[PDB]
From a paper:
A major factor that limits the expansion of shrimp cultures is, however, infectious diseases from viruses, such as P. vannamei nodavirus (PvNV) and M. rosenbergii nodavirus (MrNV), which have inflicted heavy economic losses. The Nodaviridae genome comprises two single-stranded positive-sense RNA that encode the capsid protein for viral capsid assembly, the RNA polymerase for RNA replication, and the B2 protein for host RNA interference suppressor. While the shell domains (S-domains) of PvNV and MrNV contain conserved sequences of 62% identity, the protrusion domains (P-domains) and N-arms show low sequence identities of only 17% and 43%, respectively. In this work, we have determined the cryo-EM structures of T = 3 and T = 1 PvNV-LPs at atomic resolution, the crystal structures of the P-domains of PvNV and MrNV (PvNVPd and MrNVPd), and the crystal structure of the S-domain of PvNV (ΔN-ARM-PvNVSd) in the T = 1 subviral particle (SVP).
The structure of a smaller-sized T = 1 PvNV-LP particle was determined by cryo-EM at 3.7 Å resolution. The subunit A of the T = 3 PvNV-LP was used to assist in the building of a complete model for the T = 1 PvNV-LP. The final atomic model of a capsid protein in the T = 1 PvNV-LP includes residues 64–368 without the mostly structurally disordered N-terminal region (residues 1–63), and comprises a canonical viral jelly-roll S-domain with two four-stranded antiparallel β-sheets (BIDG and CHEF), a linker and a P-domain. A structural comparison of one subunit of T = 1 PvNV-LP and the subunit A of T = 3 PvNV-LP reveals RMSD < 0.2 Å. The 30 spikes on the outer surface are also readily discernible. Although there is no extra density at the interface between two neighboring subunits of the T = 1 PvNV-LP, the high structural homology of the S-domains in the T = 3 and T = 1 PvNV-LPs suggests that the Ca2+-binding site is conserved.
Residue numbers in the entry:
A (entry chain A), B (entry chain A), C (entry chain A), D (entry chain A), E (entry chain A), F (entry chain A): 66 to 368
Write the structure that this text describes.
């Protein structure tokens, strides 16, 4: 078994809600964060969790630090329920949901402008849980679920109720794990993202290619270029709008043909930047008399 | 320091080239594979290498297994040059490039239908190299570069020359590392990929949405949907082609407006599958009398 | 090796910026301070670092103390990236830049009115870095770069956004180093400074020298006197403006000749003060009938 | 206490004077060098001495090496008087000043073409002396004063008197100190220096700026630019001489206005070089028809 | 690691320059010799350094022995700067460049007719430097650079200035290294040299070959013969100048055809000598009536 | 004594000859390779052997690896005769030469498609042999001579005779030596080589020099440039062919003067490349109207 840690990991922010925004006792739950190893998308532990099969938090002490002044006050209670199918979201009594919160071991009751810690209590046996995204049963792959309950109305410096929502802190983990059995573990968790939208150049000479240089991107990362344009009237003048762009080093072609007899808006470009964060592509137009702009999107895997 | 391993990693295939395809002594180099921790895109070690700053192969024994029968023969030589700026690609003598290959320590000389191993010789000091993609100088972040040289013409069962290229084996690592100083290490290495191209449905009723169910994808992975169509004549009949698709659960919109007065082909959809590998989206057309098909691409981060 | 410390060193102030002043995720970086031994110009460690070749922070724990009351609140995160070419200034996601901040080892997450410390994590080998100003590669001479990221909008006592910039604290180091190999290490870091601008006296008698005594300077420090005057009409009356000043003890002459046939405004004076912080110079004018004032600047090396 | 050393330090040269140049017995003293830690301006020890309060030479053995051949001869005597207010410069007998020199402990009597050493004798108590420039009393901050006396007329290869002064050797220290109580110790000892004098370019176009590139300076050091010109007749042709120079990166402006109605010759420029030792500044002239040259001085702190 | 030494190696001679030949303080540097293992072309250590990747001088004490009498005198200072990018060639003060020389550890100050030694101070870590010719950064492959500064004007037996340059000594190393990781290390350092120029014989009989025996060469070394002739008028008589020379044992042909219709002056001969230092070649002329001499050059790799 | 190894060294290839190509029993000897330390020109050991006087193989196990398939068969026998003047090349019986081969100790009898090793048996005394090229007697400087004898006709997959020669394997050493008494050992073994033949440019302007840039050479290696041209008719038009080329940095001149009154084709150029493998030279022609091409050869020491 490969023992890793201790490090930190950013889970979420927590939005303490106003006294008028709480209607049912199920509405008091501010965060419901699973503490599986594969449920913090983008952090250090979730990128590591898809390279072993099993894991076990030896000590995953959740750590709250506030972002709120010392002139507003509200009491929280914070626990880690080790039974991932027990659910406090269907308890109809507001005093019952907070007796259920303090009764859980390791719970810790704080004013929400104070840094306090909640440790995860390990199970008496040497039980390993599966990593990765969740299959059929949650009890194979979640060791705990982190809750925060609001027990008091959000008060201010004069004894009055704050009537607006207020993002109040951040939850940081401090983990220590035993991974085991290295498997590259498919159904990856890297979510792609539209990085930015930047348009092509407007060339002068018909049929002669030009080099367009885009700047301000990450150094030496592979991107994916998809064409998409917004609200262009290609029939405001004569000619056929034909745009074909290729990378000078990468792979793929983009064909933009706004001929209404045969219309083709397709293609993709795979190209990585240089060490400065730039890449260049050759754009050629058969009819350069048309000056309608055309954009393209930058798709990248961020985590 | 976190000691990891031992495991295996698939580097490349190796294409043993014919006797007529070798012209200069620089052409004998079959593979030039850097043995940095961040230069095997998609494997286990490269996914792990961007979560620590430094690394050191305590034992990275490269292991060749063949995929060629016992009736063709060719002698290889295989070494790991620990000086990543020394380059054998500019040596003009064919006998010099193979005396330079056997003189390197840890080199191993095999017939190419035989499984033989080449160990990486560590440096006498306790020197750590940086992970991640390479910056200015290669000697900060490459511990070795793996070469394979072809020293004999590719012969067959009767003593004659094979005149075609022949993929012959595969290179597997057996690594053992000391990582250190956990940093999430930006400029990620996850390259995105066009997964498959599948088109929208052809609905019957104008203005009433329908649910399109795409199957055969990975379970519980986040995708990115980009619109692109190929060679459609939207002016073969009357009407305005307006297609708007939204996910029922995810995020984003796709607008396909083939009005030649204002043309908008844009948008993206972020949506993840269910546990069966399917996801569904609501497609509505204002004018359903037009039966031109429209496609969309599936962008996903694969590693 | 000469082991020095522990002492303190003033790095910078940190200007926590308002919620409207943050546009891109790269704008959240408040300070980007290199923690090389030669990158704190004027402190104790940078004056010492140019008298040895190498250094290694055994413990350089950065220490934040606030200068802001307990009625405004904002959460910081603070880390020391040991890889001086990894750059978080080109990450396009605001949640990614703060997961990258907490994942770094030794990071520490605080409300910005609270004194918290961030230790520098040493590298597993015994690696020495060069001192002095940076040459070609930064990884030879920077052991870490200190960042501070703002993760929460700057809030006040009532839950409202502060709309102005607010200098909030100060960063103090607590260092402990092993220097080695004494070299006086050229390209010094002492920046000169215009100390103050004070003008000459207006003497009465032509051709007879007078002693001008300037007060209020540092005791027993060598200065440099350069002549410069502002907006004088020397042709408002007759005569030739000739001013020649020499120190009574130091070195150099200043010649001020406003003859429009041959104009000479040049010279410098090197003279040090006495133990009281004063020095005196002999000023003689050939034509004292002209009462245009003439100034001179005081150049001094401050650190 | 921080124990430093052993290293070397260049004190001075020593000019052995001729037999006709010695008139009084006080004239035999060749060098009178204080051996305080802050009295060798520019060396290694004086740059280090202003970063602690106290010091004590455990062994500061002064070391003479000659620069004179073996064909001229003269006997020296060399001692270190530990009482910095005892003065041998007011002893009227030439035989008394050399009995006073050999009687001092640690004195060493050599021919002046021979390398001999003089050790500093420490005081029987554990007495620390203050660093920095000298205040009221010298006995708080000087541990010794180094003398060299000439006891014999300067003779040559044939037994005749050399009648000219002759620089003969150099004095090198070999020190070993205990510093204590780190204080950054104001009234710094870095003396500024006119580096070189270089003039502006003569531009062609009026009102359009040009870039002047000065080369041959130290890499990555901050300078100070002061304007000063020598003997220019600005009324040899028509026009108003207006020169305004700014750095492209640094700080400050220089205004040169030779209008005799309002004359302004002022300003300073703070700018540092690049890694090649060059810096560039933008020079613009309102009236470029005047071709009088104008210079500027380069002020830099050298030690 | 293979520990080698101790042996000696001849670095250079050193030309002490006259008092009139020193203009700038950068001109005082007599030698600037890098002390890399691959920067003494022709010695023992540089021939050995291209057969391992790394090296570390455990003790490389530079040793000066003079070649000048005891009747001229000049003081040197000699140090080994361990930071190969620190450069004293851009320091504008002549007293600063010699305080920077004595402050370096291991420096040693001698009269230049005296044998003195300068040891190389090793770095506190176990750092190995690359061998071979220098790549991008010098700090990977130079452990030190050897300087010698002239601090005193070159004086003679009577106290007068020598006005001519004077080669004065020689610098010998005394090394002790740890090499590691045997690699044959391309881009070899063996520089070829025109050994001597000797011409062909003038044969009598047309079309009958003769044996030309060249003597006075190195025994059993492979040479390379290239044809080149100087100022021959081949049209002073009738006939066609055709000369073809082959070795009797070696490889290659030389064709000398001075036909102005088709002119061919080409070819090379590879042939090694016998154990006596001679080799013989067959020279045949089709038209022996022409008595113009023709030469050939002897190319050999000397180190 | 300096103990080196163990490493590998490429000796030769071995050409197994057909059944019809064997006539006399002396023709069965495939390789006759001396195992002196100075008889593998270009390898690691021969470059090291000319830097000590003596050597002794403690273990020089010769290692055969085949390059032939498993469908042809032939039996070899392989031994190392420690008596370098005993010669099996004058034994008239084919069965005697193979009884003499197996009787030698350390001999090893293999099918020629199988990797087998032959160890060198050391002599019972501690006898050192001289390095370098061989003088008068071979028994001072050869410890062994490696033979391979073919004992069986070369057969194929069906029991028939292969009638063509077939290069079959390669011989690799695995050495371990004690060198002694460091001497730089003259009559070097570096053989020079014509690298490539590339011609001059054809300039346009008479008398104005142009810069010719040759690419594709080894980085930072010193070359030697010799002029040689092939079959040029310089009298096809008017003018005098005068070509003079100099390096911009190196040493030497080439003069090409095709004046038939005084003809000079001579000169050499010594110039090294930059770090990219290129060098440039200035070519000037007095009469550029002549467009006959002229070549030059590149001489380099390869090992």
């Amino acid at each position: 078994i490969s023992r890793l840690g201790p490090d930190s990991d950013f889970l979420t922010s927590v939005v303490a809600k106003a006294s008028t925004s709480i209607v049912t006792p199920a509405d008091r739950i501010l965060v419901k964060q699973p503490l599986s190893a594969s449920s913090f998308p983008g952090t250090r532990i979730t990128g590591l969790s898809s390279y072993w099969e099993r894991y076990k938090w030896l000590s995953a002490v959740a750590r709250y630090v506030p972002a709120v002044p010392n002139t507003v006050a509200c009491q929280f209670v914070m626990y880690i329920d080790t039974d991932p199918l027990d659910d406090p979201s269907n308890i109809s009594d507001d005093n019952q949901i907070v007796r259920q919160a303090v009764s859980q071991a390791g719970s810790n009751q704080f004013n929400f402008n104070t840094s306090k810690t909640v440790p995860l209590i390990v199970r008496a046996d040497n039980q390993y849980y599966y990593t990765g995204v969740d299959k059929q049963n949650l009890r194979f792959s979640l060791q705990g679920i982190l809750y925060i309950i609001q027990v008091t109305d959000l008060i201010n410096f004069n004894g009055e109720l704050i009537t607006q929502d207020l993002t109040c802190g951040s939850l940081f983990l401090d983990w220590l794990v035993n991974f085991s059995i290295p498997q590259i573990n498919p159904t990856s968790l890297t979510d792609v993202r539209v990085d930015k939208a930047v348009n092509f150049i407007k060339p002068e000479v018909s049929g002669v290619a030009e080099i367009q240089t885009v700047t301000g991107l990450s150094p030496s990362t592979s991107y994916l270029l998809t064409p998409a344009f917004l609200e262009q009237n290609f029939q405001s003048e004569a000619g056929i709008y034909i745009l074909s762009a290729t990378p000078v080093e990468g792979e793929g072609t983009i064909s933009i043909n706004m001929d209404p007899t045969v219309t083709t808006v397709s293609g993709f470009i795979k190209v990585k930047t240089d060490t400065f964060g730039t890449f260049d592509l050759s754009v050629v137009l058969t009819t350069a008399s048309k000056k309608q702009t055309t954009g393209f999107n930058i798709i990248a895997a961020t985590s």
